[PDB]
């Protein structure tokens, strides 16, 4: 269904550009994510998967928790991510700002891999052509792709869905692209290796599983994590208040452990090289591509 989809398109856009007016130096980060989520609710929206604030090293998977007092200081690069469903239809979005600057090269070349990538997009494509786009625009620049971190299908209640949109020309990304088809592509690009690491904390997570809990506290937390959340990722903090402290990172080691669930932890530059990312949902047509997101 094309119109859920684009309505999605619609308000990941606004609610997106809202971010960016949001974020100048000492906005709190717990603050501006909450104002995201709920301007996404109150469009009719619910989220995808909670804003991915990300700054400079950090690439995403980063959203805060209550008590995160993290600000963001002037010249930091942001990374904003921004996820919204429409009866599990997604648009998928993605923007790179530096707080109280100008465009930076760093940006310009991510972003011109998007429109890049865009352009050259059309039913019957093999995925690598994207891939050369994308590689160019960020190299030619002096700068690195990152090479293990990239777009994505997208399907019916699925964020990442098989194919991922690569941001380097590798021979045999083959896959050919079907008209209805629906992709995020997310370029990033780097000062640094062009290779990302997970690191701790694991702030986002997702159902996987129906599997049997031998406690249960736990288990009635899978309970509420099927019900409220099922098969898309959700916060930490969308959990917080519902129990005591360390009870709940508890709780939801013990699910990691079991199987049920899983433990997005954070992306971070390998050698701490600053990150750059843009990402716009598209859909396929015969000889171009609606693009969802702006
Ligand atoms: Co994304
Ligand atoms: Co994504």
Known sequence: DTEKLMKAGEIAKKVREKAIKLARPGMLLLELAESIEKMIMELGGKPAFPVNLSINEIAAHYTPYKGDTTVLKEGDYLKIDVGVHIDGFIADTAVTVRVGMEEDELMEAAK?????????????????????????????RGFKPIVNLSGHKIERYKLHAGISIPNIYRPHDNYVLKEGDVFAIEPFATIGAGQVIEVPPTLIYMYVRDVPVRVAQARFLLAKIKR????????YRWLQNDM????????????????AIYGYPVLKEIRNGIVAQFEHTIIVEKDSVIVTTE
């Open 112 to 140: 011109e891999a998007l429109n890049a990538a865009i352009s050259v997009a059309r039913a019957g494509v093999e995925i690598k052509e994207l891939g050369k786009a994308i590689e160019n625009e960020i190299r030619k």
């Open 228 to 235: 409220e959340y099922g098969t898309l990722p959700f916060a």
């Open 244 to 259: 005591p402290e360390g009870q709940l990172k508890l709780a939801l080691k013990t699910l990691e452990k079991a199987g």
